[model samples]
Target: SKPQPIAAANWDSLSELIDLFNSTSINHDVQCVVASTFVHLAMTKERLSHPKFVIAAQNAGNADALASLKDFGVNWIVLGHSERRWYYGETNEIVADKVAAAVASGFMVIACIGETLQERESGRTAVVVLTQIAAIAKKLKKADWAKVVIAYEPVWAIGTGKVATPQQAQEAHALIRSWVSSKIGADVAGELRILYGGSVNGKNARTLYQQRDVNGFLAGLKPEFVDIIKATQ
Candidate 1:
């Protein structure tokens, strides 16, 4: 976790950045979503007065938590992040439960799934990612698919400063989309956004976004976060 007062300071700067992006013609079309800790949820909700600003919970454990967030006017939730999986030992089943919970509560879900470096090296990337998706897919109805966004964040690359090559990223995303098509339907998979999350920055954002199945990104806080958003525009 980041420092406490530091997060508050960062939020202030983030607010200024959002204001700048909204006011400037070049980035006016860009939208930003900030995920805050439980302690900051109320403040985060207050910031949502801005049209382009939305708030998300970094992680939610269960349906009750999801319902609470919905009551707080948060319509978005980031589930199954690598940190929650690796550090906190959040199993696929747990993440799937949260995904189902969020969807049931009408919250848009950013469901993170990926393979570790060892899994990739062992050629188990597809298997690992598909397994993660299956757990969540089994819990979701066809209509629930509309609210889900798949984020592919390879565990090895996260915070490692090693970004996946465009080919590697595209291959994983295309495979995930294919799996979704097979599980759900072609139409739903086509409309679904599969985002690449590992080590994403502005310098590499354009190249990664150019990939066939790469719809968007799940980036960490960096000076280039704004630039990455601008790249989409």
Candidate 2:
């Protein structure tokens, strides 16, 4: 947690950034979402005013928690983040429950799935990812698929500054797409957006975006983020 005043100041800066982005022509194509900790939900919900931006909860523990966020004007939730799964010992079943709850509440979900270094080294990346996806799949209705955006973030790459190569990201994303297609159908899979999340920055964004199934990115706050957005343009 951050000092209360320091957190407020950062939010103010983000508000300005959102305003600037919304005033530009690029606003039509670029959108932003701020995923805040639960304690600051009320404050964050009130501060967001830009038309091109919205707020999301970094994680939700249950259906009741998702309901609470809906009351605060949150329309999105980030579930199954690597940290949530690793540090907190959150299992795929737990994440699936959160996804089902969030989707039921009409919140757009960024459902993250990925393998750890050990799993990747053992060549079980697809096996690990698909297993995670299966848990969520069982909880979702066919129509609920439209509200989900899959984010593949390798545990080894995140915060380690070791970005996955474009080819590596592409391979993972393509496999995810294939899995969805087989489970749901090609049409629904084609409509789904699969995002890459790792050490994404301006330098690597263009290459990653060029990948066939790499529809977008799930990135953190960084100095070069503006450049990364421009690269997408």
Candidate 3:
């Protein structure tokens, strides 16, 4: 597994989760919690005992939001989700700017990218995903990559009951790693962590984690999510 286990759960469910973490007392390894923008500050108020837990935002907010978050130990954000792309009309450059600003504000970013079912059938998965990643790559300084995590969430598989076969997940992750090594450097690529978020659950998470390049995951919040996920913030 990767160094971090990010739980993408909302605040209400998190309140319900306080007890879960309380009982797991022996190193739950929950490193990041992505909460709704409304309660980002409020999460800083939680009495959780874990020391490694850090708050993360589902989307980057304004200057005031970023400033306020940092004061309370919020150091992570997620951007470029497929929903941000197709649903909200966030362009590649738009997401790149968000990533840049977030890093500038001292926040680590979970940058998301994915290929649609149509693109996959057309054999354009590589082109689409790399292009998406390249946009973010274009804006990063050599040092910026150190705070970045690339999450590959095949739009076709997320929450759709259709999951990528383990080999397929490895293929996409491998493609991403090789692309990074080519465009960036071997050290950055080797150090870079790529996550797969295609309807991953405990059942398949084990096998998927076996892939050499599949560093971790960014699962969507589901009813079962609270039990399947955790983090301090």
Candidate 4:
């Protein structure tokens, strides 16, 4: 399938992007996943389709935002994305709060976890990712596992033009599944949709998608456009 139409970030930016995505040839082929914010609804709701509404990109661990999200009727949310953690300095603790808050607000969580090149090179990839996942898993009620999606994005591959080979991505994703199974349960881990994001493009999109544990993507740059569509085809 084509990449899902997820409009990331605040309302101002999303307004422009949503217009473009809606008018494009791939409108129904993709779902518009918008950020979670009050301003976001006022700007995008009129333009979005039913049962295919906005996806909260960030919860900010705010109680008010969580409560308000129910009113927004946001069905999906992206939590612990690498940009929010590595770029914006969101600690694991804060991500935990955001995940919990998202669950409390009744939004399904896309719980992202990954390692930087430094961590990967130092053989700390599994440890770093496992630590973050365990922290949040411990907080979530077992029933909440159904709502969570896992995105494994290596920090170095994010915008460096150096994507991970499909095999490398599979290894990491498989490791995550094994860890989730051990910590949570085999059934829960198998059902979870783990996505791979980081320097993914048309050329490598499908190759990466073909990996065992990679069910989807938390795309960047050219997703939802021809590049990703070609790959999906």
The lDDT per prediction is 0.75, 0.74, 0.72, 0.68
Q: Number of the top candidate by lDDT? A: 1
User: Worst 10-residue stretch by lDDT in candidate 4?
Assistant: 2-11
lDDT of 2 at 124: 95
Q: Write the per-residue lDDT of candidate 2 for residues 79-154, one digit (tens) a residue.
A: 9989889999889999999898889998988898999987988899999999999899999989998888888887
TM-score (C-alpha, index-matched) for candidate 2 = 0.86
List, residue by residue over 1-233, the lDDT tens digit for candidate 1.
Answer: 10000010112365555455445343334345666778877855664354655677867867777788888788888889887888899899999998988888899888999999888888999999999999999899999988888888888775565668999999999999999989899988887878877776776777877777887677764456666666553
Clashing pairs for predicted structure model 1, backbone only = none
Off by over 4 Å in 1: 1-31, 159-161
lDDT comparing candidate 1 with the true structure: 0.75
Per-residue CA lDDT of model 3 for 1-233, tens digit only, reads 24444444333455545555444443555554444465534754464455544557766647677777778777888888888897999988888888888888999888889988878878999999999989999999889998898888889775555659989999999999999989998888887878776776765766777678877677744444444443211
lDDT order of candidates, top first: 1, 2, 3, 4
Report, for all candidates in order, the number of backbone clashes.
0, 0, 0, 2
RMSD of 4: 3.9
- Clash list (residue pairs), candidate 4: 34-55, 36-56
